Amino acid sequence: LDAVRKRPGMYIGDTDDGTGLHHMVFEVVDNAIDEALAGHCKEIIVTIHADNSVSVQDDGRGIPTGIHPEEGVSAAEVIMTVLGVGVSVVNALSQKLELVIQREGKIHRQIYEHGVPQAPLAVTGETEKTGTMVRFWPSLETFTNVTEFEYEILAKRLRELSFLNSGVSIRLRDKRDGKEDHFHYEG
Ligand SMILES: O=C(O)c1cc2ccccc2o1
Structure with missing residues (x-):
């Protein structure tokens, strides 16, 4: 976990042109898609x-x-x-x-900072529902020049993903300007 911080491009991709930055999103999205391919997840929401x-x-x-x-x-x-x-x-x-x-x-909650947990995984309440939420703030020590997420990059990839995952609802939301998309392929 410290070799990663020292040479991040090997692990995530170019940290100066935005490639690495958006791959961060897709790696988290992959985790959710793994649950959909195993048949347990029907809905994913990606939010900027x-x-x-x-x-x-x-x-x-x-x-x-x-x-x-x-x-x-x-x-x-x-x-x-x-x-x-x-x-x-x-x-x-x-x-x-x-x-x-x-x-x-x-409901369980946990906070990390640069990969280091601030406390143990903790129960915070009760829930009818099930699922994982991951929210991350990329480090500006690592990611340079291109530091903004770009809607169209995310949209293009998620649309591409919907076709490979039948019956999976994939919503993209941008809180910066209200843009919203919904990829739901059923063939
Ligand atoms: O119920 C399980 O065994 C289970 C759920 C799950 C979600 C993400 C990664 C691995 C996982 O294993």
């Missing part, structure tokens, strides 16, 4: 926030929250902090990352 963060929400099972017997911390944290390339790469290159899991009746 106005504070330079992107969130990806899915309605799958939720990342397992029980304690990993080998590692001694929640399985979710194990996924976020141990070496597509992996969601831990995104976590490593994010100055902040918010993880919210809905699973087994309980």
Whole structure:
């Protein structure tokens, strides 16, 4: 997790032309699409926030929250902090990352900063629903020159993804200007 911070282009792509930056999104989206291909997730929402963060929400099972017997911390944290390339790469290159899991009746929440958990995964409330929400703020120490997310890049890729994932609702939302798209292919 520190080799990643020192040579990020190897892991994420060009950190100066926007390629790496948008691949951060797609790596999180991949995690959600994995749940859809296994048949558990029917809806994904990608949101570009106005504070330079992107969130990806899915309605799958939720990342397992029980304690990993080998590692001694929640399985979710194990996924976020141990070496597509992996969601831990995104976590490593994010100055902040918010993880919210809905699973087994309980809402779980955890905050990271540069891949380092600020506290253990914690139960915060109760929920009928299930799914994973990941919201990340890319680090401007890593990402240079191109520092804004670009709607059309995200839209083009997500549209491309809908065709490979039948019956999966993929919504893109931009809170900067209200733009909104919905890719839902059913063939
Ligand atoms: O219920 C499970 O075994 C489960 C849910 C899930 C979500 C993301 C990654 C792995 C996962 O495993």
